[PDB]
């Protein structure tokens, strides 16, 4: 299939779509869709008392991946920053003190690339890298 489409078989050519947020803690996103077209944008906003870190507006690219950096609303009361939730992923763990961990998993049929588990190190940093949920195609 040409750019921005994926074949239903391994080879009809269906349009690529970027994953929606499973959730977005302490903020909202607009438009709120089940999945997003290539070229479409999603804009993030935080509730009162929170800092928006990462990219507040992200665009869906033709390979099904969002550009920019993962948005997060972080109140800041933690030893490490809020690691956020990559779009397509689920995160277990709601504490960011020294030693605390968080585990990630790609929902739906997305392919996880990166560190499934991270620990809040002593210097205010998370271990490893950030997981990124790829579409099964591409």
């Amino acid at each position, epitope marked *: 299939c040409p750019q921005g489409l994926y074949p239903s078989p391994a080879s009809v050519c269906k349009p690529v779509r970027c994953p929606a947020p499973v959730s977005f803690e302490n903020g909202i996103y607009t*438009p709120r*869709l089940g999945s997003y077209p290539v070229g479409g944008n999603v804009s993030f906003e935080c509730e009162d008392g929170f800092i928006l870190r990462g990219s507040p507006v992200r665009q869906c690219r033709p390979n099904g991946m969002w550009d920019g950096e993962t948005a997060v609303c972080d109140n800041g009361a933690g030893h490490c920053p809020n690691p956020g939730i990559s779009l397509g992923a689920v995160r277990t763990g709601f504490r960011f003190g020294h030693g605390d961990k968080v585990r990630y998993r790609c929902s*739906s049929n997305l392919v996880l690339t990166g560190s499934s588990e991270r620990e809040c190190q002593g210097n205010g940093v998370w271990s490893g890298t950030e997981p990124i949920c790829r579409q099964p195609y591409s």
Partner: antibody
Framework: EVQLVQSGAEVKKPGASVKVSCKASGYTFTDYNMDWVRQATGQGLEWIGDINPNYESTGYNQKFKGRATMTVDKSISTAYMELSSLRSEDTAVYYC???????????WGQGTLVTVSS | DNVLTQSPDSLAVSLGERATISCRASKSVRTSGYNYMHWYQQKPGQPPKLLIYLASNLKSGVPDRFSGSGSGTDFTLTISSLQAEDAATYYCQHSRELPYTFGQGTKLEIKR
């Protein structure tokens, strides 16, 4: 070519629960959320909540106080809305409605009448 | 929650004449350069039908006598030349935030 077909009319006593179904066809079911909206006869439209079939994650209007529960069965491209602890004021036509890429409700089920009364 | 107030609640328009319906949101529906306001038509016995998306864009298959304008908290739906099939109730709806909410509806009837 997109079609949303809902289950039939229901009649319920106060306190009971009702579960309305919405079968989707004509598009890739996981491309879009399914939303639910109701309309009391003669009155306006009220959004209930939505569900993302990819994740089975949900959002609800707070006014329903957790009484509404949305689920999906991806194998049959069907969404469900269960509303519990029914009151007479829940008498309404219930719609499933599906967004487009502008987050407008481009497609609507035919409606399901739910009558709640002693 | 955003409250959408439409005016008039009802109006009578002669066939061929212009009909204008307003929608005022209590909070702005504009973000990221788009106005997240949509308009629907509803007739008795049927679900609403989408007419206008993102304030001013005609949905495919809708006649071009329908148009929409406005930004921020102020919006209008205009039928430039009313036809008998246009008698219906019209609703605005925002998609700026949750809960999605609708206006109360404006009933458009044929004047005689």
């Amino acid at each position: 070519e997109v079609q949303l077909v809902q289950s039939g009319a229901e009649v319920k006593k106060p306190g009971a629960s009702v579960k309305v179904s919405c079968k989707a066809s004509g598009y890739t079911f996981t491309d879009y959320n399914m939303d639910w909206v109701r309309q009391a006869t003669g009155q306006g439209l009220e959004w209930i909540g939505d569900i993302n079939p990819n994740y089975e994650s949900t959002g609800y209007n707070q006014k329903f106080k957790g009484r509404a529960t949305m689920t999906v069965d991806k194998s049959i491209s069907t969404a469900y809305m269960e509303l519990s602890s029914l009151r007479s004021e829940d008498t309404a036509v219930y719609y499933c409605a599906r967004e487009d890429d502008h987050d407008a409700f481009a497609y609507w089920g035919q409606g399901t009448l739910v009558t709640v009364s002693s | 929650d955003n409250v959408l107030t439409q005016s008039p609640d009802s109006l009578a328009v002669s066939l061929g004449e212009r009909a204008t319906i307003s929608c005022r949101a209590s909070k702005s529906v504009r973000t990221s350069g788009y106005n997240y306001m949509h308009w629907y038509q509803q007739k008795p016995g049927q679900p609403p039908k989408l007419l206008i998306y993102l304030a001013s864009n005609l949905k495919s298959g809708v006649p071009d006598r329908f148009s929409g304008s406005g930004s921020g908290t102020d919006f209008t739906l205009t039928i430039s030349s009313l036809q008998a099939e246009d008698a219906a109730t019209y609703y605005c709806q925002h998609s700026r935030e949750l809960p999605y909410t609708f206006g109360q509806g404006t009933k458009l009837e044929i004047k005689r």
